[PDB]
Structure 1
Protein backbone atom coordinates (compact mmCIF):
# COMPACT_ATOMS: atom_id res chain seq x y z
CA UNK A 1 0.00 0.00 0.00
CA UNK A 2 1.17 3.35 -1.27
CA UNK A 3 -0.27 5.96 1.11
CA UNK A 4 -1.87 9.12 -0.23
CA UNK A 5 -0.19 12.47 -0.71
CA UNK A 6 -1.30 13.87 2.67
CA UNK A 7 0.64 11.18 4.53
CA UNK A 8 3.76 12.22 2.55
CA UNK A 9 3.28 15.86 1.55
CA UNK A 10 5.56 17.42 -1.06
CA UNK A 11 6.34 20.67 0.73
CA UNK A 12 7.28 23.62 -1.44
CA UNK A 13 10.46 25.41 -0.61
CA UNK A 14 11.38 29.13 -0.71
CA UNK A 15 11.60 28.92 -4.51
CA UNK A 16 9.88 26.40 -6.79
CA UNK A 17 11.90 23.27 -5.90
CA UNK A 18 9.32 20.80 -4.56
CA UNK A 19 11.00 18.67 -1.88
CA UNK A 20 9.50 15.21 -1.55
CA UNK A 21 8.99 13.37 1.72
CA UNK A 22 11.11 10.47 2.99
CA UNK A 23 8.26 8.05 2.29
CA UNK A 24 8.09 9.25 -1.31
CA UNK A 25 11.83 8.73 -1.80
CA UNK A 26 11.56 5.28 -0.26
CA UNK A 27 8.64 4.37 -2.51
CA UNK A 28 10.86 5.51 -5.36
CA UNK A 29 13.47 3.01 -4.22
CA UNK A 30 10.92 0.21 -3.83
CA UNK A 31 9.42 0.96 -7.23
CA UNK A 32 12.72 1.05 -9.06
CA UNK A 33 13.97 -2.22 -7.60
CA UNK A 34 10.53 -3.80 -8.01
CA UNK A 35 10.41 -2.91 -11.71
CA UNK A 36 14.02 -4.00 -12.20
CA UNK A 37 13.45 -7.27 -10.35
CA UNK A 38 10.27 -7.81 -12.34
CA UNK A 39 12.10 -7.57 -15.64
CA UNK A 40 14.74 -9.98 -14.32
CA UNK A 41 12.29 -12.62 -13.06
CA UNK A 42 10.31 -12.26 -16.29
CA UNK A 43 13.48 -12.78 -18.33
CA UNK A 44 16.29 -15.25 -17.75
CA UNK A 45 18.16 -14.21 -14.63
CA UNK A 46 20.66 -16.01 -12.44
CA UNK A 47 19.01 -17.58 -9.41
CA UNK A 48 21.55 -15.82 -7.21
CA UNK A 49 20.96 -12.57 -9.12
CA UNK A 50 17.21 -12.94 -8.63
CA UNK A 51 17.95 -13.75 -5.00
Structure 2
Protein backbone atom coordinates (compact mmCIF):
# COMPACT_ATOMS: atom_id res chain seq x y z
CA UNK A 1 0.00 0.00 0.00
CA UNK A 2 1.38 3.37 -1.08
CA UNK A 3 -0.08 6.10 1.16
CA UNK A 4 -1.78 9.23 -0.14
CA UNK A 5 -0.15 12.61 -0.61
CA UNK A 6 -1.29 13.87 2.81
CA UNK A 7 0.88 11.29 4.59
CA UNK A 8 3.88 12.36 2.47
CA UNK A 9 3.35 16.01 1.51
CA UNK A 10 5.60 17.54 -1.15
CA UNK A 11 6.51 20.82 0.54
CA UNK A 12 7.48 23.69 -1.75
CA UNK A 13 10.65 25.54 -0.74
CA UNK A 14 11.23 29.30 -0.99
CA UNK A 15 11.46 29.01 -4.78
CA UNK A 16 9.70 26.49 -7.03
CA UNK A 17 11.76 23.40 -6.14
CA UNK A 18 9.24 20.91 -4.73
CA UNK A 19 10.93 18.76 -2.10
CA UNK A 20 9.50 15.26 -1.72
CA UNK A 21 9.03 13.38 1.53
CA UNK A 22 11.26 10.57 2.72
CA UNK A 23 8.37 8.17 2.14
CA UNK A 24 8.11 9.38 -1.46
CA UNK A 25 11.84 8.85 -2.11
CA UNK A 26 11.57 5.38 -0.62
CA UNK A 27 8.53 4.56 -2.72
CA UNK A 28 10.50 5.79 -5.73
CA UNK A 29 13.22 3.27 -4.90
CA UNK A 30 10.60 0.56 -4.39
CA UNK A 31 8.89 1.26 -7.72
CA UNK A 32 12.26 1.43 -9.48
CA UNK A 33 13.39 -1.96 -8.23
CA UNK A 34 9.91 -3.42 -8.69
CA UNK A 35 9.83 -2.41 -12.36
CA UNK A 36 13.43 -3.57 -12.75
CA UNK A 37 12.55 -6.97 -11.27
CA UNK A 38 9.42 -7.16 -13.43
CA UNK A 39 11.40 -6.67 -16.62
CA UNK A 40 14.20 -8.98 -15.47
CA UNK A 41 11.69 -11.76 -14.88
CA UNK A 42 9.92 -10.96 -18.15
CA UNK A 43 13.12 -10.70 -20.24
CA UNK A 44 16.57 -12.25 -20.12
CA UNK A 45 18.12 -12.33 -16.66
CA UNK A 46 20.16 -14.81 -14.67
CA UNK A 47 18.71 -16.49 -11.59
CA UNK A 48 21.31 -14.81 -9.37
CA UNK A 49 20.44 -11.43 -10.92
CA UNK A 50 16.76 -11.92 -10.08
CA UNK A 51 17.80 -13.05 -6.59
Aligned to 1:3: 3
Query: Superposition pairs for residues 26-37 of structure 1, below 5 Å?
Result: 26-37=26-37
TM-score by length of 2: 0.95
Backbone CA RMSD of aligned residues: 0.6
Counterpart in the other structure of 1:49: 49
* Count of residue pairs brought into register by the alignment: 51
1:44: how far off? 2.4
Deviation at 1:43, TM superposition (A): 1.3
Name the SS for the 1:41 alignment partner: helix
What 5-or-longer segments of structure 2 have no aligned partner?
none
Q: Structure 1: any 5+ residue segments left out of the alignment?
A: none
TM-score (norm 1): 0.95
